[PDB]
Structures are given as C-alpha cells and as structure tokens.
Amino acid sequence: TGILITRHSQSETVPACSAGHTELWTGYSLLYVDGNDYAHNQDLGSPGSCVPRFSTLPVLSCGQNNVCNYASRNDKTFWLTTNAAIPMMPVENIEIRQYISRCVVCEAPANVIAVHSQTIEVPDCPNGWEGLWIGYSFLMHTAVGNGGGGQALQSPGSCLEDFRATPFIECNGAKGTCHFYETMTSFWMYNLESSQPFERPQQQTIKAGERQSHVSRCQVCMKNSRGFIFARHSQSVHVPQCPANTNLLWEGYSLSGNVAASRAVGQDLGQSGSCMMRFTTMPYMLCDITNVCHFAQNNDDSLWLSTAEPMPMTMTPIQGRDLMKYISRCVVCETTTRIIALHSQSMSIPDCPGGWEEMWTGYSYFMSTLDNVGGVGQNLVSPGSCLEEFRAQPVIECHGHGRCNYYDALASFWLTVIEEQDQFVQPRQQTLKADFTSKISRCTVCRRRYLTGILITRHSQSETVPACSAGHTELWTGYSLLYVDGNDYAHNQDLGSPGSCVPRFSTLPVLSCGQNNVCNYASRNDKTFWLTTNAAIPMMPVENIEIRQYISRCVVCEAPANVIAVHSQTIEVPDCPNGWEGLWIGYSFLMHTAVGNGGGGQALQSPGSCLEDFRATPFIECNGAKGTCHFYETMTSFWMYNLESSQPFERPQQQTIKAGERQSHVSRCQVCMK
Amino acid sequence: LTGILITRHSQSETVPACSAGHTELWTGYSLLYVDGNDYAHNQDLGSPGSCVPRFSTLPVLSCGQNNVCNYASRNDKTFWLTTNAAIPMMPVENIEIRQYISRCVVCEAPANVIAVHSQTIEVPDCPNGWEGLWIGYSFLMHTAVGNGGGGQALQSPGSCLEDFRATPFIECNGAKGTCHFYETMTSFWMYNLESSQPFERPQQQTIKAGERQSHVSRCQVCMKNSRGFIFARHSQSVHVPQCPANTNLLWEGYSLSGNVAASRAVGQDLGQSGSCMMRFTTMPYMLCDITNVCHFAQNNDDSLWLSTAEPMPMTMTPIQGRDLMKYISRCVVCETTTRIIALHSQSMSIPDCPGGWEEMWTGYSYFMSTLDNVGGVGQNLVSPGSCLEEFRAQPVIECHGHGRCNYYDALASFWLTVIEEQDQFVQPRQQTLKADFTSKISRCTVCRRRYLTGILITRHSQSETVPACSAGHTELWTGYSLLYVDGNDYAHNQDLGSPGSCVPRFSTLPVLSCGQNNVCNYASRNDKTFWLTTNAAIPMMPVENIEIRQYISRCVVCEAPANVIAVHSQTIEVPDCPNGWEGLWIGYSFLMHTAVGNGGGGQALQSPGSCLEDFRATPFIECNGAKGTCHFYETMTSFWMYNLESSQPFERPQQQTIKAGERQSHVSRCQVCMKN
Ligand SMILES: [Cl-]
Ligand SMILES: [Cl-]
Ligand SMILES: [Cl-]
Ligand SMILES: [Cl-]
Ligand SMILES: [Mg+2]
Ligand SMILES: [Mg+2]
C-alpha cells in the first residue's frame, strides 16, 4: 500500500528508486514559491516537492474580479540546485537545466523517517528499521530578508545527501532567469560533540573544507508493522512514557521550532523532529555563499516546549544548568497503525472513532506567535495539537547567547469552546485566568486498533455537507477552515488534512494567552479565513446566521488505503498512477494571499491541492470579534498553470486572462487512492 | 530666504508650477517608494526627495559584499504617484508608461509650510497668520501587496493630495520595465468624523463610487506669512500641555503615535504636528480599493495613541467608550521663530542646550515602540518627539476599529540607556530592572534657537577620525554613525543627514527594552545594532574589544547659517548646486540598505545622508548587541541610485552584472549644497 518517498539528486541526474520500490514519476525539485510577497514551501520529503514540468513560473495569480494574471508581477520560484559552479550572470532558457535538481517519487512498503545525530556521528536506524541513505541535517533557508522556510526534522527532506552552502537557486518568474544571490543563506543542524550540556554555545567561524565536520549527520530509515511514529511530550523535567501498544524509539528534549534570520519555523509537536536527543540554545549554524559558516556569532533563536517551573522572582534570563528545570522532555514512539487527534471545540472530550483506541486526552493547542518573526503552529490532526497540560506560556525562547526566558510578545493560541447554538453568534469578549481550563477545547489522541487508519477530507465548496465515498466510513462533518490570523501571523490547516474540517463554526475559534497567566477571547483584532461556497458575492459584510451560506462544509472519512493528488500541469485530467483509482477530479490549487501577512498554501500531493470547483476567490475573511465576514480585493488565489504550450525552460509570457478563459489556463488534477 | 523648499505633485502628466515669488529649483517624477530586496523604503511626498529628475522603472543598483553589484537582476519594484489616466488591462511598457507617472516641482519658499487636517468634510482654515497654498484630501497610508507599503507624515504637505484617487500610485516591475495596477493595491485616507462623538464606537460603513469623496477628511497646505517653524508637545496625561515661552499656540489635540493598517505600523513623529489630532477616534481612517469601494472599520486595523499613566483595570479587559478619555494623552502644536532640537546625554545628567539655544523642557530619551508582526514606530533622535517628559514602560496604547483600546503583551518600548564613557566598546552587562528604571535611562533636553534659525548638519567620516565642520558652521557635538537599531526584530533607522544618526557614545546596545508588568531589560534578549563603517579592512571573523573602534564611522553635528540639501545627478557627473546655493561636499547617491532578517532602511533623497563621500559596497557593520562583537555578513546589501546617463526615460532596464573595477562608474553622484 502506497507510502510515498521522494528523493532529490542535487544534480542534473534523475535519481532512482530502490529495487522493489515502484517509481511513480520523476521531476524537478521545488523548494518554495514566493507569490505576492508570501513564501509557500513544499516539504522536500513529500511528493509535492517533485514537479514533473519545470517553469520559472508554474503558477497563475487570480484576483477578486474574474481576471487572472500570468507572469504579470514579480513572483519567484525556488528549486534545489546542483553541484554546478555558481555563474556570474543569471542563466536563461536551457542553461537553467544545469542548475535544477531532479527528483523521483517512489512507493515504499513501510513508513520512512529521518533521524539526526546532532553530531559528526552518522545516526543508526532504530531496531526494525533499515537505512536508505545518509546525509546532512538541512534545517532552514532564506533567500533574502526573512523570506524562506524550513524542513520538518522527521521528514527525509531534512536529510540531504550532499552538503551545499547554497543548496537552492532563485528564479525570477516573469524574466525566466535563475541566479544565486549573496543574501541566500542555508541553516544546518550543528555538530554538538562534547559540548557542555546547558552551557553557553561556543561560537565558531568555520571556512571551506572544515565546514562538513561541523554539520549534524542524518540517516533516512525505512521500517522493516508499517512503523508509524509520533512524539509525546511531558511538559516537565520527567521523561514521558510511550502509551500502551507503542514502543520507545528514543527520549529527548521538546523542540518547538527555530527562529533564524527573523523567520520562525516550527517542528510539529506530533513528529519526531520535535524530540531532539541533545538540548542546546543554538542547535544550528548559518552557511553563506562564500563557503563560510557561523555558529552562534549573530542573533538567532530556538524555541522549546517548557515545564511549569516559574520564572525566578528577578525575572532575569535563565542560563547554565538551571535551564534543565525549564525544558520539557519527550519520547518518540513507534506504532503499527496511524495516530490522529480529534478536537471537540467543547467541554466534552471527544471519543475515538469506532475501531480506534485512546492514547491520551488533553487541550487543543493551535499555535504560538512571536514579535515580527511570525509564529509556529500545529496540524489539528497531529498529536502535537493535543497537549496534555494547558499552559498560557507553553514555549520558552532561547538564544545563541546561551540563555532562555519568557519574553512578553510570546503568545499561545488554543481552540475555544463553541456551544452549538453559539456558532453563528458574535463572539463575546472575555478575559480569563489561565487556570480556567473549562473555556479550552478538549482533544483526544487515538491510534487505530488490517486498516492502518488513513483519513480523507472532502470540501463541498457549498452549503451542503458532502458524503464519503462508498465503502469509506464517515468520522465527522464540519466547516472548511483555511487559516487563522492571530497576532498578525497566518497559521493554516492543509485542506487535505482533517484539521481543516472543524465540527463547529465561529468567526473566532481560538483564544490567546499571554504573560501573567491571563487569557483573552475576542479581545484584540484577529480574523479567520474559511473556504467559501458558490453563493453570489455580497455587496457588504454578512453577519451572524447569514454567514452560513458562505462557509464550505466538509466531511472526514476513514479509507482503506493511501490517497494523493496528481497534477497534469495541462488542460487534461491526469490519470492516476498505475494501480491507483480516482476519487475526484478538480483544479490545481497551490497557495493564497490576503490582507497583511495573510497567506498559505497546499502540499502538492495533498487532496487539498485539488479543488473540484475552480473559484477565483475560494475563501472568505471573517472579522473575528465583529462576527462578520466579507470578500476583499486584497485576496489572491494561486493555481498551477497550464504549461501545455511551453518548453521546460521557455520564459513565461505575460497574459491577462478574462472571465470564462480563466479555467482553460489552470492545471487539472485527480485525487487517487491506492 | 534660507532655502526652505516646497514640493508639489501634479498627479498628472503635466509638470506643475511654483507659486508667486517661489523660485523653481528642479522638476521631476513623483517617487513614492522603492521595494528593494523585499524591503519598502518610502520618500516623504512633501519633501524634495520624492521629486526625482530622471525616471526609470529601476533607478537603483544593488551591491553585495563579494565584489559584485547587480543591476536589474532580481525582482525589485518602484512605486510612483500616478495620474488620472484610465487603468490599463495589462502592464504598460516603454513610452506607454509616461501617461501614468505624476510630475513634480521643487520650489524655494520664504517661510515654513505645513498641512492641516480637519478630520471632517470641511476644508480646514489655515492658522491665523498663515496663508493657503492648496487644499486637498488627507492621504495617510498605502500598501501594494501584503503589508508592503508606507505612509505620510500628517504635518507634511505630502499627506494632502489635491486629487482623491482610490489607487493614487502605480507599481513598476524594475527589470521588466513595465508598470501596472494590481487588485491588492490599497490606499488609506483619514475619515470624515463630522457625525460622531469622539469616544463613541466607530460606526462601520461600506462606501461606493460617488459617495466616497464625502467620507474623506479634508486638508489645506499652509505657508506662514517669523518663518513659523512648528512642533508638537505632549502631556502624557489628560491635561492639555502649554506652549513653552517664546512660542505660540496653534491648536490643541490628542496624541497620535501611529496607525497599523494591513499589518503595517506607520508612526507619526511625536515632534511633528501629525502627532496631534484635533479629534480622537479608535479608527481615524478608512481603506479604499481599486474597484472604487471604501470600507470604514469593517475589517481589522488599528491606531496607536500616546497614553496617560491611568492604570489598566485589574480585570485586564479592553477599555471602551467614555472610559477611553482617561487613557489618551493630550497635546498642543506651537509655532516659533526658530527651529527645535533634542539633545541626549546617554547618562543621568540632563544635557545643557548649546550656546545660543534655550531650554523648553527636559525628559527621557524615547527611541521606539515595537509590536508583534507589524513592525514598530520610532522617533528621530533630533526631534523633540524623542524627548518625553515622563518615563513609561508602556507609553503607547493600541486601539481597534472595534472601538476599544488596551495594552497588549507584545507592545514594547525602547529608550536610550545610560552609556558611560568607559562602557564604550565593552560587552554590555545584562540587567533586568523591576525598579529604579531611571538609573538606566538617558536624559534629554529640548532646545530652541534664541537671525540664525538653528539649522543642524551632520557629516560622517566613514573613518575612525572625527570629521570637521565646514568653516562658518559651529560644531555642536561629535559621535558615532548610527544607521539603525534592530529591536524585537523591527529595524528603526536614523536618517544619516539627521543629527539623530550621530550618537555621542558608542555601544553595541545603546537602548534598553521595557514592557508589561513594569519591567525593563538591558541586553536580555537578542537585539543588534548597525553602524556606518570605516575604510578599515574586512576582518576574517567577528571583531571584539579594542578591534571594534577602527570599524565604527565617526560623525560631527554642526550648526549651519542656511538650509542644506543633497542634489543627485543620476549620472556619473557631479551635479551642480542650484542657483544661489554653494557646495559643501560631493559623493555617491546612497538610497537604501537591507540586511539580515527584517533589517533595512533608507535615506531621504534630499538629505545629506543620501550623499556618502566614499563608495563602499558594504558601508555598514552589524554589532551583536549582547555579545559585544561586530562583523560583516553576506546578507548585507547596499542600494545606490543608478547612473542613468545613457538610458532613455522609459527604456527597459538592461540586466547587468557589474564586477569590482567598474562598480563606481555605475553609481549616481551627488553634491550637498547650502543656500548661499
Ligand atoms: Cl510574476
Ligand atoms: Cl479578537
Ligand atoms: Cl531587479
Ligand atoms: Cl539583547
Ligand atoms: Mg493586527
Ligand atoms: Mg530576533
């Protein structure tokens, strides 16, 4: 059954699958798209980072007035690059090919993960796992400023076989050229060998041939049970225990994320990338285009889940071995079946679906935000969105300097209780003490008790609740959540994830918590964004029960096998891979931008990247505390472009596409099940 | 005539003309801002820097640390005020651009010129003794996409556009040589508050087509008929402050710190009249979109007000309604015959005014406020707005379209700290203060000149030796060349032509941060500072202690007898000074900079700070605040005005990689000029 692994060559060569592993397609290694000044990344370990047809601009931009614009602004694409020497001038048409990494997508017989030693040692695979390749721990990237992204440390995409200081190239979309720029920065996990635990990082500048001995090593491992894994966090100084019917792989320290070059990139707390075997206030170094790397020389941060230990009365930063009292511990566990989280949005703890068993219960944790670096958020189907201890301040901030503290702008967001009758009523402002756990949505983490436990999410893009495919089991129905804009950070749910299908609607489904153990509901200026229906656009915002005709409905279904989207990048519907069968066809939906810092995007292998109805404005903006929703000219949708008339490295030609011609310029897709 | 300059934009293809006896200095094209390396650097539409003599879709060059500059090689943008021409269906190129670029003129005026805003449908009268030059609509902010954009100073004539347009600017893709209008472009205009009580909830509205004009605040641009320099003064209390001696009251109002629209905070300098609004409201503006619809208080935007010492309610719930009166600081706007400056001691000593200057008030050195994911609002350190009479850990309160205000945890303040002489070039000592804050806050004095009007000039040596004043100029102080502070990941700059960029005492951390619960923190987090650097050689690794001084540019602040501007040739030729002006120095046209993270900033093109005497591809250094070490990084970019000598105006820029050995020959030149 179709567990899918993606391999990147970091060269002009197309990589190969192993024997036994069936090749699904080959392509070009896509890192991220910069659309309307918003960076939307693909996971390098996922099939969505392997794009069959190259273009410097494989996307189309669509606005609120039935006009789409191709290659009409200043959007960029970023691709993993090769070992070719850095050119003096930007490269154009077929010379580009020498600089774009190639990739292959393969079906593996069992789960595949990356493990990281955080040292010069190559880490071993866990018992019952075997190595596929070894490499270097690739953590984050920025092209310029804080525009960039980062990898999940559980993902094979965080383990690149070739260490390169500049591992990606930047393409000017409409100019059709690609180049390297001095601001391009890579961030790699650092070799912590023999470092003094909890003491100040020993700053280093490293050059040329000595760089590699300072990079953390990794191995990508496949299970020989299909070997699904997850993390569990104690939120205390005590190491937690793996739940019944799961086996301990390793213990560690709870990594929430990293803030490099003023961009926070989180590690999902359900994944093994949130459980580091070695704690440090600075887990990574930066590497520049002149083959110099700097460790703890400038001003970057790490974020760790914390304990309930109080700040000292002096409120001075914590340093030295005192830090041990403040950092949460974790374990990584292996299970024969998949793990999910369910959120009630009520005081009721949700029950596990029929056929599943409860691993733990907790509180619905949505995101943490920071000042002027964005934030770090959880997938609402991940166990990381279900923390067993409610905390106003669940995350502590640490610096290259070697100290950590709670700083005032650190905020947390949790799903709130929404009584059924209150869904379409204006949120009522409330300030609460952080021991009032009765205002916080409850959650349950479940493993499947043979079906491995795959969930499919479908969005109707209408007022009608959609049905599961025949033979699939309906688990719940809900409303199509796209993202929450909280303290001016946009945290998305992928539309293929059950986390985008929330059972209860509200213009404000979250509350925020801050310092002094105080939480606030509907007390500031937050907003939420939902996939919308086919209803006519209103002349002014809609309010309370009128909102219901503009919110897409959804259903979450349990399916016997894996599901992916495939994209033709042409006007034709793509066939499913050999051995897979189609569930629905649609239009290739990549990313979106909106007012302020608003934006997000879909994984290209996710069913969320395949919407059945093409809509230039597929989502609506809800004013959180006002209880009203509306469409705005600041909303943009990005779809994969129909490249049928283009050569791979041909420069995009500007096109303004009007009315009924828009759909003919949009890539088609099919959602397929093994 | 001392060389006071007024800038007018026609919002049309026709070049505008100067008033009666006003002498024309030059004409040009109306530059709004430049988006370089994903950083927006704006020109003040009321200043000569917004009037650029030679158009290009990309009039700038990008230079890096590794011996290469790039022209038209990335995805940089320019934004220009536009005309009344109909919006095209697709981007326009080459000569088709011309009909869409507003023209401008720079004129010499005999006296000070300001904008006054009614915040109503009524055109405000000029203050007694002032004469109107034009009337218009109150233009506050703009965004092109996301939170990239900027805003006007409400004292500036640039906040008073004669023609109201929902889309008053056009966007040019630098390297493609095309310009266009995009659906995400938004303008923000001050709102007509005629039918509303000040502390009642904003009554949200959606306004269509023909009714939009009647909801826009009106303004008049006024010239003094004394030259009538003005300043604001804030009480930080509900009491209306008094105008100091030898100054006269123009109006009283409420202390506006800034606005946060589409997730971009744009401050009003607290020394300028734009920080003193006649009418308070939690939502002073509306947004207007490209489809001729405006929305007032329908979505989620903010205003920022200087606050009183009134305690938050113990419940910590937001404040609403009549209760808001207790929290909003009051202000006055005063006129004076001479100019106003602030001096900062960086110590517990209160500084004395220079010889020939008289003290108006004393206070504490206020640098900036930061907010979460919208940036921050900062003060010019020579402005009286950088000298607040009362220290406050939380000097600013945040207000919403909803009609409520509160302090929120992410709202932080930054103050200049005490730096002893012996603390310079030493690693900062961490300190968390729960009491005795004033032991670590710099003191300041606001002075007016006692005839010379008190014009101050700043020179940067780009060396470790202090530069000299031009003869006839009086030296007031010397210092170190501060470019910007990166605090809570907001970059707040000092213009290199402002005396605020000349800091008497160096530290890798010259500020401390204060926040909720009345706690201040020095060297406690991860802040950093950027200084103009020297001619010294690039180090192989970060420098420390006795090595840092050779890398920090020195500066001098001098009093000049007449006004001083930079002029730019936009060619390899050194430009002549205007008729009746004489040159002080020559140099290279320095527009903006970007660095790690959210780091960046830029110079006003009429400021001497836009004219550096030495070209350096990496003209500044990055100091790690708490570590006390400084270094150069590949993330540092400098932007210079480009040599357009052989470019036709609407010609498409040609990509060029420019290697060391010819970088200087592609850089516009400048001369800094003083009125005779
Ligand atoms: Cl584009
Ligand atoms: Cl809110
Ligand atoms: Cl460019
Ligand atoms: Cl610091
Ligand atoms: Mg906001
Ligand atoms: Mg930072």
Author numbering:
A (entry chain A): 4 to 227, 1003 to 1227, 2002 to 2226
B (entry chain D): 3 to 227, 1003 to 1227, 2002 to 2227
Copy text from the publication.
Collagen IV is an essential structural protein in all metazoans. It provides a scaffold for the assembly of basement membranes, a specialized form of extracellular matrix, which anchors and signals cells and provides microscale tensile strength. Scaffolds are composed of α-chains that coassemble into triple-helical protomers of distinct chain compositions, which in turn oligomerize into supramolecular scaffolds. We solved the crystal structure of the NC1 hexamer, determined the chain composition of protomers, and found that Drosophila adapted an evolutionarily unique mechanism of scaffold assembly that requires divalent cations.
To overcome this problem, we recombinantly produced FLAG-tagged single-chain NC1 trimers with specific hetero-compositions CVC and VCV using the same design as in transgenic analysis but without a fluorescent protein. Thus, the CVC composition of NC1 was able to spontaneously form a hexamer although this process was highly inefficient. Moreover, once assembled the CVC hexamer was not dependent on chloride pressure, thus confirming the Cl- independent mechanism of stability. We were able to obtain diffracting crystals of tissue-extracted NC1 hexamer (at 2.98 Å resolution) and CVC trimer (at 1.75 Å resolution) and solved their atomic structures. We solved the crystal structures of tissue-extracted and recombinant NC1 hexamers and found that the tissue-extracted complex is indeed a heterotrimer of the same composition as the recombinant CVC single-chain construct. RMSD of superimposed recombinant and tissue-extracted structures of Drosophila NC1 hexamer is 0.43 Å between 1346 pruned atom pairs (across all 1351 pairs: 0.47 Å). Analogously to human crystal structures of α112 and α345 NC1 hexamers, we found multiple PEG molecules associated on the surface and in the inner cavity of the Drosophila NC1 hexamer. Instead, two magnesium ions were found at the trimer–trimer interface. Single D40(1590) of Cg25c directly forms a salt bridge with Mg2+, while K79(1629) of the same Cg25c chain and D79(1589) of the Vkg chain interact with water molecules clustered around the divalent cation. Collectively, unlike in mammals Drosophila NC1 hexamer interface is stabilized by four Cl- and two Mg2+ ions.
